[PDB]
Design a protein around this nucleic acid. Structure first.
Ligand code: ZN
Ligand code: ZN
Ligand code: ZN
Ligand code: ZN
Ligand code: ZN
Ligand code: ZN
Ligand code: ZN
Ligand code: ZN
Lengths: 37, 46
DNA sequence: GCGCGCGCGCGC
DNA sequence: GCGCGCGCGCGC
């Protein structure tokens, strides 16, 4: 997967990676706050 | 009349091409005569 | 071809 | 009824 949040960011259900319990490795988000390592 | 470039890139749902509100022609109830769209699905005619 | 940004639409 | 991620037309 690969989100585009930020143009709580990536820290909620509206973000795929968060929801799927994955990190934003390779994502195109901005100001990512996904705590997933 | 407007001139859309709908559908040029590859990655795009080909069944909604010139058949939704993002198309100026479709939205303005125009045909795509003179347009440069690829895979036009516009149901209007004049 | 790429990136910007608009606006659709779903999930709450 | 709202909010924002995402699909894609458009300027360049
Ligand atoms: Zn995200
Ligand atoms: Zn992500
Ligand atoms: Zn993120
Ligand atoms: Zn069109
Ligand atoms: Zn057209
Ligand atoms: Zn068309
Ligand atoms: Zn469904
Ligand atoms: Zn279903």
């Amino acid at each position: 997967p690969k989100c585009r949040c930020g143009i709580t960011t990536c820290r909620n259900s509206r973000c795929p990676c968060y929801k799927s319990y994955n990190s934003c490795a390779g994502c195109h988000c901005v100001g990512c706050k996904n705590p997933h390592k």
